[PDB]
Ligand binder design. Structure first.
Ligand SMILES: CC(C)(C)c1ccc(N(C(=O)c2c[nH]cn2)[C@@H](C(=O)NC2CCCCC2)c2cccnc2)cc1
Ligand SMILES: CC(C)(C)c1ccc(N(C(=O)c2c[nH]cn2)[C@@H](C(=O)NC2CCCCC2)c2cccnc2)cc1
Lengths: 302, 300
């Protein structure tokens, strides 16, 4: 019983964190094989104005780097640009490199953040990529380079390196190929995130979990067609629903079909009437169907 | 900026999880030094009816245990009873045992849960001990023996070993000395948890975190004294405010006194759910002052 946002165990990722310092800038890097990957703004001089990163790298002084895993210091062999990241070739292989891949996540997908400071893991929590390509993180100064990851069958899938915080407090990263999520710039210029729409498929997964956990007061006798809901959704800050075959077994276990939940979402989007659903007082879109099925039943969909 | 319920990195505890099987029962244990600690109901026969744990232990055959760390099986050399736990002596020392202590937590305290199945960690998340001595976990069958703990300067402080789930879904465990939180029985019974209440000291911590993050729409322009709030609190599902010293550090940084936050709690309670605070239910009680200070300022 229960539904909690949770992270996968962080042990295999913890051994990949290093401290990367250039001059007076210090942040975190990921050490995999003989490469350290980190945000390129570690070589930015000052926080304003626009940075010519190509020029900065051209006048780089390699011995001005300090890269360490605990008190293991890594010598820098070379540095090249990789989008919004640096690829730093170092002189030692991380013998604790896990089996890993890179994958770029899409809005609505969940992953784990390993929040790091001074090159050491400090905390771990689950996040979900918003439609505006930001995440609801908790980071303070020094967390840049903190990685986001999933673990599938022993393979670490890296999908995020923390880059910056927008004025509203939402958090922006790049994928490990250096492509910034949402096209935000790694520059100090003013930029604002777009509006956030609730990922409706995730809201549906949450309401199914609510039913499985005995929360039913909110459920509607009505029902609304997918097509009609989608018309309403785009005027009410929620995404459209594409298809319901991922709710197949959830629909069977509870007896409630998507159309009934869609009508429930419409009533609950205003307010919860002073009531709560699993402790929430507004709809949450942070849980995917995969997370719900895993937490309800211990099945990992592939 | 931001506020999230965070777990500490779980690596040092992952290496201490083992699978403990006896008869038709399988759960998780904690392997520290040459001992494996697990709930004693692993030696109960079935779940249909009550059993005498002392009798169960008196006729136990050591070789009926199967205890494994990964694919490495441990020999069992002795077993004794420790409250609602077993202390199983094994024939190998865990070379990955961290520096560790035990401590029994109080209602309102936070700790980390490493949710485990078949002797291997599956997820990690923070919790907070409720006033009825339950936690709001996420567990399914086979999670028993999952540990709860805190990490302070590399020392692991174990405070919880998961024992059972109640009808309402809340979760019951024991401390590592075998003392069940809340006095619940490790028996198949009709027991139900006591009344739940919001932990007001944690709501105060959360509201300070909101202020630190620039959230002020809910801040009352007036104040209420603690004694008057405590009268109201016990009639509105909240705990009384007993210790105020823990908020000195947060008042010193926000310049907002506790009395003003108490008046804000009353107003939030009267329109419960009308607006979120930092993307949370306004009367969130899962964050402690310690958690807020760490996340806002990095201070240990
Ligand atoms: C150079 C550049 C791209 C402008 C920059 C500057 C600072 C940082 N921030 C580092 O904390 C940091 C810097 N170097 C090591 N850490 C922080 C940050 O984003 N403030 C923002 C201020 C407005 C516009 C620039 C970014 C930060 C804080 C909290 C959580 N996340 C990040 C990130 C990027
Ligand atoms: C023997 C005893 C004390 C009655 C018992 C029986 C079953 C378990 N539960 C095991 O899953 C389990 C048991 N052994 C290995 N796994 C589950 C459980 O609590 N059902 C309860 C049924 C009502 C009251 C008794 C316990 C469980 C589920 C989810 C999370 N936590 C635990 C726990 C304790």
């Amino acid at each position: 019983a229960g539904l909690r946002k949770m992270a996968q165990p962080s042990g295999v990722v913890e051994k990949c964190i290093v401290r990367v310092c250039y001059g007076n800038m210090a942040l975190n890097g990921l050490w995999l094989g003989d490469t350290v990957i980190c945000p390129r703004h570690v070589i930015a001089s000052s926080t304003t104005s626009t940075i010519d990163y190509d020029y900065a790298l051209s006048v780089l002084r390699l011995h001005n780097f300090s890269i360490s895993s605990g008190n293991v210091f890594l010598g820098v062999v070379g540095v090249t640009m990789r989008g919004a990241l640096l690829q730093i070739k170092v002189n030692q292989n991380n013998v604790h490199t896990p089996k890993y891949t890179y994958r770029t996540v899409r809005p609505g997908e969940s992953f784990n953040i390993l929040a790091c400071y001074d090159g050491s893991a400090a905390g771990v929590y689950g996040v979900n990529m918003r439609s505006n390509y930001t995440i609801r993180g908790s980071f303070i100064n020094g967390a840049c380079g903190s990685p986001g990851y999933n673990i599938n069958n022993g393979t670490v899938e890296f999908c995020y390196l923390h880059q910056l915080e927008l004025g509203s407090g939402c958090h922006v990263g790049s994928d490990l190929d250096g492509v910034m999520y949402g096209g935000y710039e790694d520059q100090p210029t003013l930029q604002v995130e777009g509006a956030s729409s609730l990922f409706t498929e995730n809201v549906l997964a949450f309401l199914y979990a609510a039913l499985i956990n005995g929360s039913t007061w909110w459920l509607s006798s009505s029902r609304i067609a997918v097509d009609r809901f989608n018309e309403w959704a785009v005027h009410n800050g929620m995404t459209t629903v594409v298809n319901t075959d991922c709710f197949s077994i959830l629909a069977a276990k509870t007896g409630v079909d998507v159309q009934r939940l869609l009508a429930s979402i419409q009533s609950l989007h205003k307010n919860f009437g002073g009531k709560q659903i699993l402790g929430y007082t507004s709809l949450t879109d942070e849980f995917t169907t995969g997370e719900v099925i895993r937490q309800m039943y211990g099945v990992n969909l592939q």
